[PDB]
Design a protein around this ligand. Structure first.
Ligand SMILES: CN1CCN(c2ccc(NCCNc3ccc([N+](=O)[O-])c(N)n3)nc2-c2ccc(Cl)cc2Cl)C(=O)C1
Length: 344
């Protein structure tokens, strides 16, 4: 029942005994294995991610500090299933749900996720992206499963930095990255010089999925993923193909008309949600809004209303405590982002 381990963790390099109990398996996958546990001293729930080390998550997790990113409490090396292999354990903050599971509850119940939650969850996702992109860090795996959620407080926390990397101009990066459904079209065209706007495309895919109740681009392969994008956005132009990958020149594809954005979504869909979505799911990577510009979109105006409350009656979580680092990409947007009632 009680497991005792020694571990340094974030902040100062000082290993200490951490005792936890009520260990339970959350899930298994590409990430490794994630367990739920309770810290004995405080009685706080935590998520322990055990990963086998062979063949940058730790490096990135020790530097990040944000309200919409799951924090690293502690980290330790241990034994595991495989003898003589080294396993890294990340003790992170526990959040009970995922955007995937919450969206799946509403879909199975023939409902669309309420707009108030679509606004709250997307705003906090873009806010977490504005923060990591201000350090040049691209997540490269934005999807509903990686967006942790606390249903009662409506707090969203971005997790799983196992695909994350600091993008530097001049250094190439792998094109086969991101879960296929949320993969930006530059990556499909084999671009190695892509930017952090691949996460904005992936966030646009998450937004569209919450408005439709099912993935907008459910491709069965890298090639079929592009067919799903073309069926909605229409055939990309030469300029768009050059913008996505400057070294691709061989795209022969039939002329498919774009599906108008008003027709993609159901008639009850708010126009501002559609308008925001059209500025994220753009072929040209530079034409996409930055995460900080997405936060300042008119679709999130209700969150900036002094009288906004969650359906349960609680206040919204913290949305306007922006740091200077977080506003770096566009300091003048602080006028829109921090409303009159939230300033000082
Ligand atoms: C294939 N799998 C099956 C399980 N599964 C799943 C089911 C329910 C929950 N509920 C939230 C529980 N808490 C939690 C989880 C992860 C972290 N984390 O930092 O990674 C933290 N801090 N907390 N999460 C997960 C989950 C999400 C992301 C990652 Cl990487 C790992 C897991 Cl198991 C999946 O999405 C897909």
């Amino acid at each position: 029942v009680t497991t005792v381990v020694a571990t340094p963790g974030q902040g100062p390099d000082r290993p200490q005994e951490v005792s936890y109990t009520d260990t339970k398996v959350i899930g298994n996958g590409s990430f490794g294995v994630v367990y739920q546990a309770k810290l004995c001293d405080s009685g706080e729930l935590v998520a322990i991610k055990k990963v086998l080390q062979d063949k940058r998550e730790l490096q990135i997790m020790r530097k990040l500090d944000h309200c919409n990113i799951v924090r690293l409490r502690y980290f330790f090396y241990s034994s595991g299933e495989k003898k003589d292999e080294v396993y890294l354990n990340l003790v992170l903050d526990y959040v009970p749900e995922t955007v995937y599971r919450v969206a799946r509850h509403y879909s199975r119940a023939k409902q669309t996720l309420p707009v108030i939650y679509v606004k709250l969850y997307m705003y906090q996702l873009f806010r977490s992206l504005a923060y990591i992109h201000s350090f040049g860090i691209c997540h490269r795996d934005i999807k509903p499963q990686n967006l942790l959620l606390d249903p009662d407080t409506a707090v969203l926390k971005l997790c799983d930095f196992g695909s994350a990397k600091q993008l530097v101009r001049g250094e190439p990066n792998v094109s086969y990255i991101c879960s296929r459904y949320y993969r930006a079209p530059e990556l499909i065209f084999g671009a190695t010089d892509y930017t952090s706007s691949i996460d904005v495309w992936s966030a646009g895919c998450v937004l569209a999925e919450l408005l439709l109740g099912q993935p907008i681009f459910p491709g069965d392969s890298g090639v079929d993923q592009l067919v799903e994008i073309i069926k909605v956005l229409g055939t990309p132009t030469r300029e768009q193909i050059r913008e996505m990958n400057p070294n691709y020149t061989e795209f022969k594809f039939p002329q498919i008309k774009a599906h108008p954005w008003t027709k993609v979504f159901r008639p009850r869909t708010p126009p501002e949600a559609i308008a925001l979505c059209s500025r994220l799911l753009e072929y040209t990577p530079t034409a996409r809004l930055t995460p900080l510009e997405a936060c300042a979109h008119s679709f999130f105006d209700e969150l900036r209303d002094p009288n906004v409350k969650l359906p349960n009656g609680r206040d919204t979580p913290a949305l306007f405590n922006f740091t200077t680092q977080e506003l770096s990409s566009n300091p003048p947007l602080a006028t829109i982002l921090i409303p009159p009632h939230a300033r000082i």
